[PDB]
Amino acid sequence: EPTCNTPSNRACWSDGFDINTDYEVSTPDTGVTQSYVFNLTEVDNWMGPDGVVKEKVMLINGNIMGPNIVANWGDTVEVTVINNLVTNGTSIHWHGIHQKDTNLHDGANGVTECPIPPKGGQRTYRWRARQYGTSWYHSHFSAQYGNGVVGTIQINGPASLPYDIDLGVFPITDYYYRAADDLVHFTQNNAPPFSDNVLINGTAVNPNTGEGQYANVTLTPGKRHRLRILNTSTENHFQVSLVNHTMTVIAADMVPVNAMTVDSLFLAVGQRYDVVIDASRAPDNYWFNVTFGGQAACGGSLNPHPAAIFHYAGAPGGLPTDEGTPPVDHQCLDTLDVRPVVPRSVPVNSFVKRPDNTLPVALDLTGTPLFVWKVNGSDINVDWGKPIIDYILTGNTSYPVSDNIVQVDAVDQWTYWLIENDPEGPFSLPHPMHLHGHDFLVLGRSPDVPAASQQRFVFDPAVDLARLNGDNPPRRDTTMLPAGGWLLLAFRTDNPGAWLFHCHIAWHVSGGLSVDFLERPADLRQRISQEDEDDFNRVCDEWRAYWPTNPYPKIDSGL
Amino acid sequence: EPTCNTPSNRACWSDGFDINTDYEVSTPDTGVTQSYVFNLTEVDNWMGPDGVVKEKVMLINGNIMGPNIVANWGDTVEVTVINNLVTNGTSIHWHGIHQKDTNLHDGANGVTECPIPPKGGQRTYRWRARQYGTSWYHSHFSAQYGNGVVGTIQINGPASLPYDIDLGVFPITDYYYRAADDLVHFTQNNAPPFSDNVLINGTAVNPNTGEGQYANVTLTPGKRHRLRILNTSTENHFQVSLVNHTMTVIAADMVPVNAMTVDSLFLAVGQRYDVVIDASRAPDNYWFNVTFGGQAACGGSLNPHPAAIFHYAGAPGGLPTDEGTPPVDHQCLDTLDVRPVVPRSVPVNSFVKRPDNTLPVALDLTGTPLFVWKVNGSDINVDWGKPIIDYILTGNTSYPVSDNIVQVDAVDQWTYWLIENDPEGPFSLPHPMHLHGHDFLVLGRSPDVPAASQQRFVFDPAVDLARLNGDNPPRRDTTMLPAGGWLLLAFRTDNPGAWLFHCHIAWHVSGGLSVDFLERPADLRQRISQEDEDDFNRVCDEWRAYWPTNPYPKIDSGL
């Protein structure tokens, strides 16, 4: 609970806790628990917000998204998940929540848990809110979250700029009328489709019939508003802009940053930005536009102009009349100019590229299906019925090859990872790379060029070491791997666990594009509670008894 | 020679000849010959117009392009081509020139001729100017024209609007520092690169160093100016626009059309537009911009803003200061709104799709090399040493499968052709389809959608017959096959000959994307002069004696 957080002093939170506190190591002891119950149901012939009826959706508590989780910094969040789907298992992953020494609550089926079985299976997740900001949750059962198993997280805390009004969450997502498993099957042998629409806070107008509604945000004239923008898509990467207004970034993913004013923002799949908008212009209706850059390399929509309305209170109703001007083309790249308020410093001069720190991503066209994504030679394929944690608990280290285990034994040390984007393959695409368990430092990447330009880079210390930044670089949980290029990340091994590191485009992680960092496994078994072990085994027993009765095969990685 | 063509009466040409004459069946008898000698040489370490030195170019008469061919409607054009290259043969094709009963002058090596051998081989081309407008010529020896064996054609004649000043040709082309054979090898296993620059009338500024110069067109205030725009690229498809001005189209390719005013134009590879520009704006310097649309599906450049300067005479010098707005995205599609002045009408209600009128284009990823283009099951591969005309002249009908012969025996009848763009393949690209020997009618295509949107269409008469237009549809020699869709063309079999029909992206026709319409072969032997037969055999005997001594393999289709 805050005691000094006010509009003119958002930096303050409570005694001992403010925007400069190192939240990764110091957490308020609030003693409070915020609990939720998620009931997952399978609904056929569901009428969506743009008027089109979808063949099948998978909903939390009967709505297009699950409830907005809300707690304070230092609370515990507890979610009972009850799976009333017909056939699918489910696992809910709390994206952006590092699960420090709570790996078994990460929701990564086949890694940290077996899936909760359908027809009434249940599990309760419990995690500490050791960060504040905007995050989200979604299924990790193959591409299930593309059917509706998704929602937002708002953990309140201090901020890097004063503001008057917290407008809350503003999730933006691609929207397909086809169901997720159908799209996974499709994308195994075909380029992915443009989205049928882009929803903004759950709604959009159908570009074809005019049904639906624009999201409508009311601004209080003369006031400073925090807007928590998310990209919860399965594939689309968005540019956002508000006509005639700038946006001031105060957080990137769940990491507060020094204020940074921009005219438009690029959000990768899974990224968030907290921004402050000053209602400083003439009272009117303004469009908030979603646009695409990068010559389609990171998505498009068949709605040519997805948008929301920002309405100044007291102004007329109606649609905005100024179409504004297109934002700069971000070329499928997030900005590396953000700077965390709580800094990190690491050396970059000593980096040496070696097989054991290099993750080559490659598209393999030579087998079945046609599009298979491999990392270091292997497409990931997890066993929902024998998760990596089961190996840890039984002392078996014979991990299957397709689990893509990258064992990291270093204890609370910075580890450096060079990811290479198929520079030798016939073509390469942008990928939004996401790490569970940690925020990474973005130490650098290949030179920024047009996403569709086919220019290729391989890391060369002679020119690239000097392009690296270890002086408080961007710190976040998702960033872009440039098409044709490379990306150098670092993270500190402060959290024993099995942690996925994967592309967040559903079609690609389905297709194999992940590894699993097995961090300090010799420390992990000691740190697993009896309750967590017992409940892991309970759910896996139920899952393993269920699975042979399932009528459908698993057709992808499981993730 | 014209006798009545004046600025206020451009429709008039001479007694019995004007813009309404059916130029396809009636030609002025001028008895005049315009002759040229083309000396092809191989130049290493050539300094190009944006200051970059290229490894190797292949030039006509020592310049970046060959001579601008100029003649009057009904003259004869004669060109002696002397091949002083070091290893390559060469064949010069007169794009847009129908070669009515002169097939052996079409310059299609492997089809209508063997290549002229290097180290001094020569051949004289001779053809009647039976069409007036703007065309171009280029080698057809694999992708050689990408090295500089290219130039323009201006056949003067009447026009569909009055105008004061003919500004002449304005060829726009992609420009690569790598040589064409290296790019063919690259694109056999890699997506094609963005161009390094785009030249306009021979010049551009280097986007990185500032070297070079902008093309500079001086407009006479208050006058109407004809501008003959061409896209002579190997791959890039361009959008063009002049800031603050419209352009009025008066011809498409070599076909005069009713005046059509637009803000911007799409030119596929090989297309031309003649436009009239009225210098009616305030005297100033204005940018002529080259832009790309279609999310890079039909090209890009590493110069983000290739441009020319249109200067009003009498105004200050220096650079335009108005950057203007970006044009509408043409989505890699040419406009089907043009209407020829001399009309054609054909029935479309009676079309029925059948194997023998359908040309399925497919990318085959299963062979060597990776990217092989097939039409009706076969990637074309011609024999430079045994052209299809050799078979005609020796009474041999055993055409190889790889010559992709589509024999058309109908005499002077409309023939209808449905081209299908790999609609069941994993992905599909726009292709600029070009027919030798004829203008075709563009009867229809699949619905216009964004080029990268992945939307696929297969011809369905229940919806698509009503979408066809046989009442004076666009008539021209190049038009777009939409990504994922289909195109329906017709042409009348008025010209016995072996006629290539192919994608004009160099990398794709090298990769197999062509067929060869063998039109009225039973009429064609009868129509070949002894002189043409004897010279065909002479050049082939020289080419066959040369070829075993060549140090390089043929690595593509030969076209």
Ligand SMILES: *[C@@H]1O[C@H](CO)[C@@H](O[C@@H]2O[C@H](CO)[C@@H](O[C@@H]3O[C@H](CO)[C@@H](O)[C@H](O[C@H]4O[C@H](CO)[C@@H](O)[C@H](O)[C@@H]4O[C@H]4O[C@H](CO)[C@@H](O)[C@H](O)[C@@H]4O)[C@@H]3O)[C@H](O)[C@H]2NC(C)=O)[C@H](O)[C@H]1NC(C)=O
């Ligand atoms: C791209 O670069 C190339 C090379 O640098 C430029 O090519 C020049 O192109 C122009 C136009 O084609 C050409 O000039 C014409 O040459 C013709 C042959 O000599 C002339 O007959 C013609 O004169 C007519 O037009 C003039 C104005 O353009 C008039 O002043 C002149 O009186 C003639 O016009 C009267 O006569 C004609 C009948 O011929 C009649 O139809 C008219 O109505 C009128 O009564 C031009 O002089 C140059 O010779 C080419 N120069 C080069 C170096 O080769 C090209 O222009 C550049 N493109 C752009 C658009 O800038």
Ligand SMILES: *[C@@H]1O[C@H](CO)[C@@H](O[C@@H]2O[C@H](CO)[C@@H](O[C@@H]3O[C@H](CO)[C@@H](O)[C@H](O)[C@@H]3O)[C@H](O)[C@H]2NC(C)=O)[C@H](O)[C@H]1NC(C)=O
């Ligand atoms: C999770 O639940 C969903 C929804 O029921 C399951 O998706 C369904 O999966 C089946 C089996 O893969 C899909 O059908 C198959 O489709 C292909 C071709 O399209 C066909 O070849 C097969 O014979 C079969 O018909 C079905 O379309 C799909 N339905 C939806 C709406 O997506 C999914 O299988 C479940 N997953 C698990 C692991 O149980």
Ligand SMILES: *[C@@H]1O[C@H](CO)[C@@H](O[C@@H]2O[C@H](CO)[C@@H](O[C@@H]3O[C@H](CO)[C@@H](O)[C@H](O)[C@@H]3O)[C@H](O)[C@H]2NC(C)=O)[C@H](O)[C@H]1NC(C)=O
């Ligand atoms: C921000 O989003 C708004 C709302 O979607 C966009 O407005 C839309 O702008 C398009 C393009 O200008 C308008 O469309 C067109 O209409 C004309 C005829 O009026 C037609 O000539 C065009 O070909 C075209 O289809 C559309 O009317 C307008 N929609 C509404 C409801 O106003 C706006 O463009 C977006 N701006 C940015 C910078 O992305």
Ligand SMILES: *[C@@H]1O[C@H](CO)[C@@H](O[C@@H]2O[C@H](CO)[C@@H](O[C@@H]3O[C@H](CO)[C@@H](O)[C@H](O)[C@@H]3O)[C@H](O)[C@H]2NC(C)=O)[C@H](O)[C@H]1NC(C)=O
């Ligand atoms: C027409 O003349 C050009 C220019 O000399 C010849 O192009 C050259 O072709 C050779 C043979 O394909 C190229 O070298 C080869 O390169 C590949 C891959 O880069 C390599 O695997 C080979 O072992 C060999 O070195 C060469 O780079 C290329 N040069 C240029 C400037 O393009 C072409 O072969 C001639 N065509 C005919 C049919 O004679």
Ligand SMILES: *[C@@H]1O[C@H](CO)[C@@H](O[C@@H]2O[C@H](CO)[C@@H](O)[C@H](O)[C@H]2NC(C)=O)[C@H](O)[C@H]1NC(C)=O
């Ligand atoms: C967006 O929501 C706002 C706020 O509720 C709507 O604003 C009202 O609009 C009507 C006229 O349509 C006015 O009578 C009210 O006084 C407005 N209230 C506010 C506080 O200003 C607005 O109409 C909505 N816009 C859209 C298109 O639905």
Ligand SMILES: *[C@@H]1O[C@H](CO)[C@@H](O[C@@H]2O[C@H](CO)[C@@H](O)[C@H](O)[C@H]2NC(C)=O)[C@H](O)[C@H]1NC(C)=O
């Ligand atoms: C990528 O796979 C390569 C090949 O298996 C791995 O390189 C082996 O790694 C072990 C342990 O570091 C070394 O002792 C061997 O010498 C390596 N062999 C080769 C071929 O170099 C590499 O470690 C894997 N990379 C990651 C990040 O998992």
Ligand SMILES: *[C@@H]1O[C@H](CO)[C@@H](O[C@@H]2O[C@H](CO)[C@@H](O)[C@H](O)[C@H]2NC(C)=O)[C@H](O)[C@H]1NC(C)=O
């Ligand atoms: C484009 O070419 C025109 C025509 O030669 C140039 O215009 C001359 O420009 C100088 C100043 O540089 C003037 O003093 C003359 O009066 C202009 N003559 C005409 C007839 O107007 C123009 O400068 C060139 N632009 C650039 C970018 O090179």
Ligand SMILES: *[C@@H]1O[C@H](CO)[C@@H](O[C@@H]2O[C@H](CO)[C@@H](O)[C@H](O)[C@H]2NC(C)=O)[C@H](O)[C@H]1NC(C)=O
């Ligand atoms: C027309 O081409 C001009 C010249 O290249 C473009 O002007 C450039 O505009 C960009 C974008 O703002 C600037 O960064 C450069 O400074 C401009 N160049 C210089 C020499 O002026 C212009 O953007 C193009 N216009 C359109 C609509 O594409």
Ligand SMILES: *[C@@H]1O[C@H](CO)[C@@H](O[C@@H]2O[C@H](CO)[C@@H](O)[C@H](O)[C@H]2NC(C)=O)[C@H](O)[C@H]1NC(C)=O
């Ligand atoms: C595409 O190839 C197909 C297969 O060879 C050709 O189809 C045949 O056409 C002949 C006569 O022209 C018929 O006798 C056959 O019944 C067709 N075979 C089958 C499988 O349909 C077709 O003509 C070729 N199309 C073109 C335009 O070349």
Ligand SMILES: *[C@@H]1O[C@H](CO)[C@@H](O)[C@H](O)[C@H]1NC(C)=O
């Ligand atoms: C889940 O929701 C459904 C549909 O409203 C309801 O039938 C079911 O009883 C709920 N189950 C649980 C335990 O909430």
Ligand SMILES: *[C@@H]1O[C@H](CO)[C@@H](O)[C@H](O)[C@H]1NC(C)=O
């Ligand atoms: C938005 O900004 C542009 C540039 O200043 C201006 O022309 C326009 O009038 C502004 N809109 C409103 C609502 O004032």
Ligand SMILES: *[C@@H]1O[C@H](CO)[C@@H](O)[C@H](O)[C@H]1NC(C)=O
């Ligand atoms: C260890 O796990 C592997 C791979 O899943 C399995 O083959 C083996 O039987 C296990 N060993 C025992 C001791 O459980």
Ligand SMILES: *[C@@H]1O[C@H](CO)[C@@H](O)[C@H](O)[C@H]1NC(C)=O
């Ligand atoms: C071709 O041009 C070259 C280069 O200038 C010249 O040396 C040669 O004599 C010319 N040959 C012919 C026949 O014109």
Ligand SMILES: *[C@@H]1O[C@H](CO)[C@@H](O)[C@H](O)[C@H]1NC(C)=O
């Ligand atoms: C057709 O040409 C081929 C290839 O040169 C030759 O082998 C064959 O004998 C010729 N057949 C006829 C009938 O002349």
Ligand SMILES: [Cl-]
């Ligand atoms: Cl996470």
Ligand SMILES: [Cl-]
């Ligand atoms: Cl032609």
